[PDB]
Amino acid sequence: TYQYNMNFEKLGKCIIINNKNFDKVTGMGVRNGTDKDAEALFKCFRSLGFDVIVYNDCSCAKMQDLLKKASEEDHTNAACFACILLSHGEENVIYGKDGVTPIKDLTAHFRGDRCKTLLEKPKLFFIQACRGIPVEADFLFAYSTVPGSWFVQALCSILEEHGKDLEIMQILTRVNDRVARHFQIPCVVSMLTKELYFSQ
Amino acid sequence: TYQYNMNFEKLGKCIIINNKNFDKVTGMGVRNGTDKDAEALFKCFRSLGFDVIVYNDCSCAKMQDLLKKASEEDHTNAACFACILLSHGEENVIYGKDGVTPIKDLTAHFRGDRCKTLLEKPKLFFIQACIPVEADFLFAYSTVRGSWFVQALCSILEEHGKDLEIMQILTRVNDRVARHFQIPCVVSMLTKELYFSQ
Numbered sequence: 001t002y003q004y005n006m007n008f009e010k011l012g013k014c015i016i017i018n019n020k021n022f023d024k025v026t027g028m029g030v031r032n033g034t035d036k037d038a039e040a041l042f043k044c045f046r047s048l049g050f051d052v053i054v055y056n057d058c059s060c061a062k063m064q065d066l067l068k069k070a071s072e073e074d075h076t077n078a079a080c081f082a083c084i085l086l087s088h089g090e091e092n093v094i095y096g097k098d099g100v101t102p103i104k105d106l107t108a109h110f111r112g113d114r115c116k117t118l119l120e121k122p123k124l125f126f127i128q129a130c131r132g133i134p135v136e137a138d139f140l141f142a143y144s145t146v147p148g149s150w151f152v153q154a155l156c157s158i159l160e161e162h163g164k165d166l167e168i169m170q171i172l173t174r175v176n177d178r179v180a181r182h183f184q185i186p187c188v189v190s191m192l193t194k195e196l197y198f199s200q
Numbered sequence: 201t202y203q204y205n206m207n208f209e210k211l212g213k214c215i216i217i218n219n220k221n222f223d224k225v226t227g228m229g230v231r232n233g234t235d236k237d238a239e240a241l242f243k244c245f246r247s248l249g250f251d252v253i254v255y256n257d258c259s260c261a262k263m264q265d266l267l268k269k270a271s272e273e274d275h276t277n278a279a280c281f282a283c284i285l286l287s288h289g290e291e292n293v294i295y296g297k298d299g300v301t302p303i304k305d306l307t308a309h310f311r312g313d314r315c316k317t318l319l320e321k322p323k324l325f326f327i328q329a330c331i332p333v334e335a336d337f338l339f340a341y342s343t344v345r346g347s348w349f350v351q352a353l354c355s356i357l358e359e360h361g362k363d364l365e366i367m368q369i370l371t372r373v374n375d376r377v378a379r380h381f382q383i384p385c386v387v388s389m390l391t392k393e394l395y396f397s398q
């Protein structure tokens with residue numbers, strides 16, 4: 001078929017990492033408005049049919065252990081997997097509370113060879129990294145650099161109105177448009193091999 | 201307004217850089233089959249409706265001037281623009297005949313403002329090598345008859361280039377080369393849906 005099979009017991013997991021406060025040492029300030037993002041997103045993704053977990057002010061070691069343990073779960077009865085990262089960022093790196101880890105190490109755990117239960121299933125990453133290569137099939141990255149957040153608000157609004165009738169590329173194209181109309185722009189890196197509808 | 205407005209005199213320009221033979225001083229081999237690639241691409245994109253021109257074994261400066269002059273042209277009557285790159289590739293950089301040149305420098309000429317006539321219109325880059333940012337750019341990037349990527353892109357486009365949206369085409373391309381076994385990507389900064397008709 002031309003779209004991902006969605007006939008599973010569940011839609012799948014949605015991990016939200018909400019980093020607001022950072023250790024003085026990192027020279028990063030409070031990320032005001034992120035709670036509003038985190039909350040809109042969890043409500044939104046809950047409503048699509050995801051099982052949402054929300055983590056807050058995580059260390060670098062937590063974000064790593066967190067995701068690794070998620071990648072070691074049994075995803076057989078799930079349609080897909082989503083992870084949302086709201087934090088500080090610089091080229092190819094995301095901030096924990098105590099430092100900096102490469103976005104690539106975070107996503108690497110969900111790789112065909114190390115996460116057999118999610119093979120041929122979409123793995124979704126929405127990164128909202130304010131202050132500034134995992135090349136494998138069925139990955140998708142929605143990265144935004146624009147400083148709740150415009151990107152996050154737009155994602156949520158389009159998703160709650162069209163989440164069940166549009167394909168992700170359509171959703172995220174529309175998102176790109178309105179963070180663009182508010183006037184930087186978000187992007188989308190797709191390695192997807194089918195079309196993705198969150199419905200049945 | 202959910203789709204890019206295609207109502208113009210022409211679809212637009214489509215430059216093809218087809219680098220096969222490389223200057224000794226780079227120790228880069230003959231890219232056999234890149235000619236079957238470039239011919240496949242020419243016929244396909246011409247059939248979509250692009251004004252296609254093919255340039256062979258371009259040097260680094262040729263590639264730069266090609267694209268700068270290209271951006272300097274008047275694009276008032278065109279729906280969009282498309283560049284296809286067939287070469288050797290490393291990290292964020294293409295090869296000319298006479299060495300290497302960074303991808304971004306090629307697209308820099310087409311930015312939001314340096315090419316005011318292409319503003320609000322899709323600039324498509326199809327790269328087959330073996331940042332940067334901005335509204336209405338799209339990259340289809342691959343690593344490896346001709347290459348599996350090209351062969352897939354041409355077949356799907358020959359068949360659905362007139363009824364499917366750009367992202368649907370490229371997703372099918374992705375799936376197709378994946379079936380053969382690396383995987384092509386799509387970087388999208390598009391703000392609308394893209395159809396090659398109406």
Ligand SMILES: *SCCNC(=O)c1cc2cc(F)ccc2[nH]1
Nearest residue numbers: 143187188303331332339341387
């Ligand atoms: S929002 C994605 C950020 N930029 C990239 O990751 C990127 C740009 C680009 C351009 C190319 F020609 C090929 C690959 C590529 N990745």
Ligand SMILES: *SCCNC(=O)c1cc2cc(F)ccc2[nH]1
Nearest residue numbers: 103127133134141143189341385
């Ligand atoms: S074909 C593109 C290869 N990888 C990238 O260019 C890439 C991956 C990635 C992941 C992100 F979270 C953000 C941007 C990004 N570009």
